[PDB]
Amino acid sequence: TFAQSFPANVSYNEYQYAIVQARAAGFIDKVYPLTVGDKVQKGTPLLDLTIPDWVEAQSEYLLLRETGGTATQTEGILERLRLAGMPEADIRRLIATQKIQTRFTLKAPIDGVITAFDLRAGMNIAKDNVVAKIQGMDPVWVTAAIPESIAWLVKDASQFTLTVPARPDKTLTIRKWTLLPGVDAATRTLQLRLEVDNADEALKPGMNAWLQLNTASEPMLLIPSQALIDTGSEQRVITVDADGRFVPKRVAVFQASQGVTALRSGLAEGEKVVSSGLFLIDSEANISGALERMRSES
Amino acid sequence: TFAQSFPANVSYNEYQYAIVQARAAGFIDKVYPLTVGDKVQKGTPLLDLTIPDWVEAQSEYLLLRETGGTATQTEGILERLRLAGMPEADIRRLIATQKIQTRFTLKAPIDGVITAFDLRAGMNIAKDNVVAKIQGMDPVWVTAAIPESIAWLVKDASQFTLTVPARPDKTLTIRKWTLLPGVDAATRTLQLRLEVDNADEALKPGMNAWLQLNTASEPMLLIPSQALIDTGSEQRVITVDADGRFVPKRVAVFQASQGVTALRSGLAEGEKVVSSGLFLIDSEANISGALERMRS
Amino acid sequence: RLAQYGISLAEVKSALDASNQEAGGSSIELAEAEYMVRASGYLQTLDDFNHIVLKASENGVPVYLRDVAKVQIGPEMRRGIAELNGEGEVAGGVVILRSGK
Amino acid sequence: RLAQYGISLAEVKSALDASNQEAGGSSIELAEAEYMVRASGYLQTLDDFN
Amino acid sequence: VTSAVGGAMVGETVEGIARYPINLRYPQSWRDSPQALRQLPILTPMKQQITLADVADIKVSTGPSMLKTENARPTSWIYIDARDRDMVSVVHDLQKAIAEK
């Protein structure tokens, strides 16, 4: 079981993105109590504006209404109005009130937090003037920074658990983790983005998050790390033979972590191996000429 | 228990935020004696400008009166004059004077401080220009930066104590405040905003401030921090059984404070626990292994 | 914490080894007396540790040591151990005599 | 070469006198043994110079 | 290496007559094993995030445990003796033996 921790940032969900813009040019009348950094819910009034670009088209609709126009002479002058910009919403008011629409109220498309706000009291609004950028955070995103070298340490079967210092009281629940196709050129780090259920908005975007990773490896012989004696030329472990005879044996290390090494070969499951007092014993067998014998027996 | 004093800053009210732009293109005639950093009040003249554009329609109206056109005919041309962008008050002037309005005057929409002002004499003016950006500061704002860590606490804080060096006397007990949903990334802090009243205009935007917080969390399991043997990942404590021997115990940590760590689990109340990581050798005495030597 | 706060190991040390001294600013006469200008700066509480400044934004919000590390108190590195009667390890000392005396 | 590479005499010396030492990183127990953490850094080949 | 993975001292707290050491270091877990060191996190100058193995190879190996030297050069000894036996002759048989084979 490979285990390694990584740093991570809690971020806004980028699939919760909405940059509101006016369908046509006009001027701002009212701007509701709001600003960047605030949290708006789907429906919140952003600002009031007067758009004259449609006045001419709407009146020609009301004209026909009173002059006994055709049913289809309306559906056609309403799409002439539909693809002019005027929102189907503000249009439904036109037909249900028979009055010209001059003042409209832009609202927040999604539940989220405002990150941008370029229009304020007294200005004139333009087709591009982003009235308000609102980013969500319900299924909040959290991305971890994996070093290009340790990349191999992550696979499909890999188990993940998030932990946020800001909240030691909230058990997190990951629902989708992804290994982005590219690697941050700026930090030489693989990007691992995973979205976590933020039901109660207790996991704010920008706060630290620690991602611990668990990864299954190839099936191998497994012994404790205290058991492996490494002299940078030979890998040995002191075996406890049937009779109680301490006999050293050479093994071949594969990888190790969590205080448990893994030999690629050199032993046999069921076999016993010393953990505590391993040093004295090895030394005793070194004096005894055992380690010398074992190495000579080949 | 907690006793911290977060850093904060006085700033303008962003709900009192005006950006005066001309309804239509024109050219500046006279610009009043104002500039960035000045204090203005609702009604303060900003600049005079000539706007040719409503002339066409203003004529259409005046002409209609010269030949008494239909009521709805005038009601119509006056609306084309509004939708075309033109102060509801300047139209009001048109009908009164019965003379075409060529010169106009932009004025401060609300009282505040000129933070921006980029239109002077001899210039022209476009609809995207900014004749004046005026930001109020009556209910002045203060935004403190609280360490991300104690997010679990500040969420349910009763009251803070806002102090400020500039005015050592204007210290009050903030009881209502809005904890923002965003955490700074440069630093890792929470954003806590609060509106303090500025009748005397003493708290000027740009002064340092302090938000004190004296509170204590809900009752939890508490052990002396000097008793928590913590390695990078794994970590336990040293319990003392009835017979007075040593036995390690895997524990989960909530968070420490002033020399005591709140414990999430691992051990129940009462259990005696030694208060020392001094039973191992700081220089690599493999904590996992050194803890093993204590049991058999 | 380092990666997250944009602080380096190299930076923390230099910041640490620059916030643990005392300073003398000469004297200053007044009332015909001699007033000495002392300046605090030694580490005393563990807070003085937690409150080592590493990074300060233009805004005014600083980043302390407590944000990139914990400050636990523990033992040192030893070159030798002493044990008494098998029922406990303790510390002591030997008295060494001036050779000839 | 200095002018062409934007390096100063002052810089080269400081860079040189910071790449010719050895470092000790305490010890590290494992198998009840005492493993010492040595770190290379001395100049040996002329390549280490280049 | 020195500070992060080693218990490197870096300061002292002045407490009355007493004086205690202050040292910087990573959490023990980050330095448990050789492999651990190969994944030692480093925050490079360019705020890049890498491991120790990305800038070095780490290998286990045996070697000297103490360097005894006499006269400013490295000198290994050779302990030859006899139980009882003679003396003023053997060392002579060797000053000619060794330097002749």
Return the number of other C-beta atoms located less than 10 Å from residue B224's C-beta: 15
E25 CA to chain B: closest CA distance, Å?
10
Return the number of other C-beta atoms located less than 10 Å from residue C50's C-beta: 14
> Do the beta carbons of residue B129 and residue B33 sit within 8 Å?
no
Tokens of B187: 């630093």
Strand A112-116 and strand A132-147: pairing?
antiparallel
Return the number of other C-beta atoms located less than 10 Å from residue A189's C-beta: 23
Q: How far, in Å, CA of B277 to CA of B262, rounded?
A: 18
Q: How far, in Å, CA of C62 to CA of C46, rounded?
A: 18
Query: What single-letter DSSP state applies at residue B59?
Result: H
Tokens of B23: 């309804």
> Do the beta carbons of residue B119 and residue B47 sit within 8 Å?
yes
> Do the beta carbons of residue C39 and residue C24 sit within 8 Å?
yes
Q: Does B230 touch chain C (CB under 8 A)?
A: yes
Residue E77 gets the label, from left (phi > 0), alpha (psi -120 to 50) or beta, of beta
CA distance between the termini of chain C = 59
Sort C67 into a burial class: Cβ within 10 Å, 0-12 / 13-18 / 19+: buried
Q: How far, in Å, CA of B24 to CA of B51, rounded?
A: 7
Q: How far, in Å, CA of B8 to CA of B136, rounded?
A: 19
Question: What are the residues facing E20 on neighbouring strands?
Answer: E13
Strand B124-125 and strand B26-31: pairing?
antiparallel
Q: What is the resolution of this structure in A?
A: 3.7
Tell me which chain E residues have a C-beta less than 8 angstroms from the C-beta of A228: none
Q: How far, in Å, CA of B44 to CA of A255, rounded?
A: 77
Tell which residue, B212, B33, B210, B249, has the closest CA to residue B120. B33
Q: Does D24 touch chain B (CB under 8 A)?
A: no
Sort E55 into a burial class: Cβ within 10 Å, 0-12 / 13-18 / 19+: exposed
Q: Does B289 touch chain D (CB under 8 A)?
A: yes
Write the single-letter amino acid at D39: A
Q: How far, in Å, CA of A231 to CA of B153, rounded?
A: 51
Please provide the CATH number assigned to the domain covering B16-50+102-136.
Answer: 2.40.50.100
Q: How far, in Å, CA of E98 to CA of E32, rounded?
A: 49
The CATH class given to the A51-101 domain equals special
Sort B107 into a burial class: Cβ within 10 Å, 0-12 / 13-18 / 19+: middle
> Residues 6 or more apart from A187 whose CB is under 8 A from it?
A145, E47, E48, E49
> Do the beta carbons of residue A51 and residue A127 sit within 8 Å?
no
Decide: helix, strand or coil at residue E20.
Answer: strand
The CATH class given to the A220-298 domain equals mainly beta
Q: Does B282 touch chain E (CB under 8 A)?
A: yes
At residue B274, φ and ψ (nearest 5 deg) are -60, 150
Please provide the CATH number assigned to the domain covering A1-16+136-219.
Answer: 2.40.30.170
Q: Does A256 touch chain B (CB under 8 A)?
A: no
Tell me which chain C residues have a C-beta less than 8 angstroms from the C-beta of B278: 74-75
Tell which residue, C89, E37, C74, has the closest CA to residue D26. E37
Question: Which ranges of chain B would DSSP assign to H, the alpha helix?
Answer: 55-66, 71-83, 88-97, 151-154, 287-292
At residue B133, φ and ψ (nearest 5 deg) are -105, 115
Tell which residue, A269, A292, A268, has the closest CA to residue A282. A292
- Angle between helix axes A72-82 and A55-66 (nearest 10 degrees) is 170
Q: How far, in Å, CA of D26 to CA of B284, rounded?
A: 8
Tell me which chain C residues have a C-beta less than 8 angstroms from the C-beta of E15: 44
Q: How far, in Å, CA of A167 to CA of B73, rounded?
A: 67
Could you write out the DSSP letters of every residue in chain A? -EEEEEEEEEEEEEEEEEEE--SS--EEEEE-S--TT-EE-TT-EEEEEE--TTHHHHHHHHHHHHTT--SHHHHHHHHHHHTTS--HHHHHHHHTT-S---EEEEE-SSSEEEEE----BT----SS---EEEEEEEEEEEEEEEEGGGGGG--TT-EEEEEBTTBTT----EEEEEEEEEEETTTTEEEEEEEEE-TTS-S-TT-EEEEEEEE-----EEEEGGG-EE-SS-EEEEEE-TTS-EEEEE-EEEEEETTEEEEEES--TT--B--TTHHHHHHHHHHTTHHHHHHH--
Domain ranges for chain A, please list them: 1-16+136-219, 17-50+102-135, 51-101, 220-298
Write the single-letter amino acid at B163: T
Fold agreement between A1-16+136-219 and A17-50+102-135: no
Q: Does C99 touch chain A (CB under 8 A)?
A: no
Q: What angle do CA E86, E87, E89 make, to 5 degrees?
A: 100
Could you write out the DSSP letters of every residue in A177-193? EEEEEEEETTTTEEEEE
Write the single-letter amino acid at A169: D
Q: How many beta-carbon contacts under 8 Å exist across B and E?
A: 22
> Residues 6 or more apart from B224 whose CB is under 8 A from it?
B259, B260, B261, B275
Subunit partners of chain C (3 or more CB pairs within 8 A):
A, B, E
Tell which residue, A118, A120, A139, has the closest CA to residue A128. A118
Query: What single-letter DSSP state applies at residue B226?
Result: G
Tell which residue, C74, E42, C61, has the closest CA to residue B282. C74
Q: How far, in Å, CA of B108 to CA of B16, rounded?
A: 12
Topology of domain B220-296 in CATH is 2.40.420
Q: How far, in Å, CA of B222 to CA of B257, rounded?
A: 10
Tell me which chain C residues have a C-beta less than 8 angstroms from the C-beta of E4: 9
Tell me which chain A residues have a C-beta less than 8 angstroms from the C-beta of B150: 166
- Residue D49 to residues A80, B81, D16, D17, D22, Cα–Cα distance (Å): 77, 81, 8, 11, 15
Tokens of C60: 């005014």
Q: How far, in Å, CA of C77 to CA of B282, rounded?
A: 6
In CATH terms, A17-50+102-135 corresponds, of 3.30.390.30, 2.40.50.100, 3.30.1360.230, 1.10.240.10, to 2.40.50.100
> Do the beta carbons of residue A175 and residue A196 sit within 8 Å?
yes
> Do the beta carbons of residue B152 and residue B28 sit within 8 Å?
no
> Residues 6 or more apart from A90 whose CB is under 8 A from it?
A101, A104
Q: For every residue of C3-66, which 3-state class applies, written as one string?
A: HHHCCCHHHHHHHHCCCCCCEEEEEEEECCEEEEEEECCCCCCHHHHHCCEEEECCCCCEEEHH
Residue A68 gets the label, from left (phi > 0), alpha (psi -120 to 50) or beta, of left
For chain E, what is the radius of gyration of the CA atoms? Answer: 26
> Residues 6 or more apart from D1 whose CB is under 8 A from it?
D7
Strand A221-224 and strand A208-215: pairing?
unpaired
**Does domain B1-15+137-219 sit in CATH 2.40.30.170?**
yes
Q: How far, in Å, CA of B39 to CA of D7, rounded?
A: 52
**Which chain C residue is nearest to residue A187, measuring alpha carbons?**
C3
Q: Please name the member of D27, D30, D32 whose beta carbon is closest to the beta carbon of B283.
A: D27
Q: What b/e readout covers B42-67, taking b as 16+ CB neighbours within 10 angstroms?
A: eebebbebebeebeebbebbbebeee
Q: How far, in Å, CA of A127 to CA of A124, rounded?
A: 10
> Do the beta carbons of residue C27 and residue C35 sit within 8 Å?
yes
Q: How far, in Å, CA of B238 to CA of B272, rounded?
A: 9
Tell which residue, D25, A168, A195, has the closest CA to residue B263. A168
Q: How many beta-carbon contacts under 8 Å exist across B and C?
A: 43
Q: Do B259 and C72 touch (CB under 8 A)?
A: no
* Chain C, window 75-94: residues with a beta carbon less than 8 angstroms from a chain B beta carbon: 75-78
Write the single-letter amino acid at A297: E
Q: Do B283 and D30 touch (CB under 8 A)?
A: no
Q: How far, in Å, CA of B40 to CA of B199, rounded?
A: 15
